[PDB]
Design a binder for this molecule. Sequence first.
Ligand SMILES: Cc1ncc(-c2ccn3ncc(-c4ccc5c(c4)[C@](C)(Cc4ccccc4)C(=O)N5)c3n2)cn1
Length: 890
Amino acid sequence: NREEKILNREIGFAIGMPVCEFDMVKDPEVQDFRRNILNVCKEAVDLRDLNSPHSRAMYVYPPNVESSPELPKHIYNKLDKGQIIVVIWVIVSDKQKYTLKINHDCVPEQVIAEAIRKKTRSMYQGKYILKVCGCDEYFLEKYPLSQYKYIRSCIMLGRMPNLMLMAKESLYSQLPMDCFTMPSYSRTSTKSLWVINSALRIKILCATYVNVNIDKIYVRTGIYHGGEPLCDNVNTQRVPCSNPRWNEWLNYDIYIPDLPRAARLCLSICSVEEHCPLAWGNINLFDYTDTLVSGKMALNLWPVPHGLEDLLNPIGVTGSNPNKETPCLELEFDWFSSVVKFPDMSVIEEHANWSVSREAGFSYSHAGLSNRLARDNELRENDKEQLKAISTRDPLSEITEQEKDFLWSHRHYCVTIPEILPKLLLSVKWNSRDEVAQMYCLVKDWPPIKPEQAMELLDCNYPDPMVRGFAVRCLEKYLTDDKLSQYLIQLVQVLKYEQYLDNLLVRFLLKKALTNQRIGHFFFWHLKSEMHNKTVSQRFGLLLESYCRACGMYLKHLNRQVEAMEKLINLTDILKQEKKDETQKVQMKFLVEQMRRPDFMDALQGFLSPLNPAHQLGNLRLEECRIMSSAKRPLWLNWENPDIMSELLFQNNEIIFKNGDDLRQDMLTLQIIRIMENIWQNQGLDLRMLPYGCLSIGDCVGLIEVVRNSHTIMQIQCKNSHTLHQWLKDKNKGEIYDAAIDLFTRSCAGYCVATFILGIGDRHNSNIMVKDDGQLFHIDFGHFLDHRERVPFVLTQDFLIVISKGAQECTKTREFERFQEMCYKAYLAIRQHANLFINLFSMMLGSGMPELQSFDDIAYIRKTLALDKTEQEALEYFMKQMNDAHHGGW
Ligand SMILES: Cc1ncc(-c2ccn3ncc(-c4ccc5c(c4)[C@](C)(Cc4ccccc4)C(=O)N5)c3n2)cn1
C-alpha cells in the first residue's frame, strides 16, 4: 500500500498527470486495458529475470548493432586486408592503452583475449566486457566487431575505435534488481450479427452546448471503413440551431450482417450554397468486446481542423471529446431484444469455405454475370503479368474499379505474389460479408512480407483487425531492434488509428519497450511529447502507466530527465513572456541566477541526455551556456561529460533547447535523410549526410544535437565568391586538401538530391553549415513537401567554386561532371525505394503536422521522384529542374 502510493507518485510525475485520474474513469474499456495489459508487463519482466544478471544487463545496455553483419565493398576497402586497428584501454590505480590489429569480424571475447595477450607480453577472458570510451555503451553480446554501430562509424569516418576494458562485476553491481509488483487494480439472448435480417438505422435525438454567433444546421452522417464509405451519406432535416433537436431516424443503404468489423459512424454538425462543418465526431459501430452498439449514447464533438474543406472527418480519431464543455450530440441506436455480437472466426471460416465451394462450382455463364467472378482454368499468362505489374505500383497510384474487380477475381493467384496484398485489400468489397469472410481466410494463411511492406498495412487505409494483426505478426517475426528503433516514430503514430486500446500493435510495442531500454526510452518520450494532445492523451497516458510500472529502475532515471526538461520549459517560458524585450546581457544574468538556485541546479545536472541516454550529462558549464538571438530564442546548453575517458569522445556535451517551434517536421526529415544515406552507402555511393539528433519532448518544445566544429556559410563569408573555397583550403592544407573537396562535393550532392525530393524550406547562408573537414550539411528542416516543384538548395557560385577547385569556369569542368553523376545516381537510387518513403509519410498523416494533412500532400514526392515517368524521363526531369533553378548548367 505505502510502496504502491510512492510508485504512483513517481509514475504520475513521469506522465505529467496523477494515476488516480485513471481510477476515476468509468469506461470499462479503460479499466480492462489497465488490467489486461499487465500480462505484457509480466512477460517482459520474466525475460529480464531469465538469464540473470546478463539478461538484465542486455535490457539496460542492449547491443547497438546494425541489422546486417555483412559490409559494403567501398567500406571494406578502407580496412587493411579485412582488418581494423583498435585501441583497448585498461584503467589501473592511470590509463594504459593497448593498440590491437585484428580482423573486422572478431567477437568481443577474442578482442578481450588479444588485449590480455598484449598486457601479458609487456611483463580471464570471460570475466571482462568491452565498453565504448566516453559513453555508456557496451558490447555485451557476441556479434562481429564491425556490426556494432560505433565500430562501423569509425571505419566509415576514418577514426580510431577506443574501447575500455571493464570487469563484469563492476557493471552488474551498478544495475539494481528491479521488483515488479502487480498493482491493486489488477484484482435477452446473445445473437450473432449475421442472423439479423434488418437494414441499418441510427436515431439522432438532439445536440447541447451548441454555442454559435449561422442560420440553420443539420447532422451529416456516414458509414465508413477507414476512409472508404460503405454506403451513401445521410443528412437530417435542417433546423435553426436556436433549437438543436431532430429525433429523426436516418436510414442507410447497408444490410446489418454486411457491416464489417471495423465499421464506424462518422458524423458532423454542419451549417449552410456554402456548407461548412462546425463540429465533428466518430464512433465505432462495434465495441472492444465485439458487441454492436445499442441504446442511447452521448458523443462530445471536436473542433474542425484548419484547412479541411470536407464536411465529415472519417480519418479523425474515434470516440468522445474529453472536454465536456463542447457540442454534445445525443444518439440512439437500434435495439433487437438481445446482445448483438460480431460472429467469431469459426463461423467466419465456415461461411468463407461455403462461398469458395459454391464459386468453384459456377458455370461459365454464372461467372459471366460479374467481373468480380472468374473461373480457375481461364487464368492466362498475360493476366499473371498484369497482376505482377499492378503490385510494383506505388501506394498513391490509383487502382481503377476495373483493376479492383480483376484483383479480387484472381485473389487466389495473388497468394503467389504476396507483396500485392495492400492492393488486393483495397479491392475488397468491405460492405459484403461474403467477400470479407474470404479475405480473412486468405489473410490468415497469407505468406510473410517484409517489415517495410507490412508497415503500410498499419496506416489509416487498413482499419481491419485481421489485416493489422497480420502486419504485426510480420513485424514480430522479421523486424530487428535496429529497424524498430529507426521506425519507432511511425509505429507510435499508427497506434492512433487503432479502434481500441487493447490491440496486437500496442502489445508488440510495449513488450519491445520493456525488453529493450533503448527502444523503451524513445517509446516513453514519443508518447510523453503528445500528452498535451487530447485526441490521444488517454490512450498514451494509459500506455505510459503500463510502461512505467514495468520498466524497472529506469523510471527514476526518466524522472530526472522529466524534471530537468520541466525546469527548462519554466525558465524559457518566463524569458518568452516576462523578459522578452530585455538585452542578451540582462537575460543571461536572470538565467544564471535562476539556474544557480539549489533546487534548479540539482535538477539541471547529473542526468541522461534524452537525445541519447548513453550520454551522461554531468555538471552544467554555465559560462559556456548562451541564449541565442534567433527565432524563439533557444538555449545553447553545455554539460561536462563525467565519463572517465571523456577526452576520447567529447569532454563537453552541447545541446540546443528550443521552446516555441514544432520540431516533429525536423524529426521526420532527419529520419528520412538517415534512411536515404543508408540506401546510398549500401549501393556503393558514399554521400555523407549529417542527420543531427532532434527530439520533440512536448508541445512545440524539444532538444537538438549541436554539431561540433561547424560554421554557417554566413560565418565563413563575413569572416566575394572565393571566400568559402579559401576557408576550406586554409582549413585543409597540404595532402588533406583533396579529401576535403571530395567530402564537400559528396555531401553537397546528397543534400541537393534529398532536399529536392522532400521539398524542404528554402536554403540560404544561415541554414546551411559546413564542418572544418569539408562536410556540408543543412539545419532547420521546418517545412517539407508542397508547402510546379521547387529547388530548395540552389548551388550559388560559392559552392561550385569549391567543387571545381578554385577554377573560374566551374560549370564546365570534369569535377562538376562527376558531381552531377553523383546526383543522378543518388536521385535514381531513392526512386527505387519510393514506396518506403511514401509509406513513412503515410504513417505520419494522423499527427497534427500542418504540412502533412492528406494523401495529396504526400503526392508531392510522386512528382519530385517522377514515378509515372520512365527512369530516363526521370533523369531528364531532374536535370530540367536543376537547369532552370541555376539558369543554365544542367
Ligand atoms: C549563429 C549560429 N551559431 C551556431 C549555429 C549552430 C552550430 C551548430 N549546430 N548544430 C546543430 C545546429 C542547429 C540544428 C537545428 C536548428 C538550429 C541549429 C536552429 C537554427 C536554432 C539555432 C539558431 C541559432 C543558434 C543555435 C541554434 C533551429 O531552429 N534548428 C547548429 N547550429 C548556427 N548559427
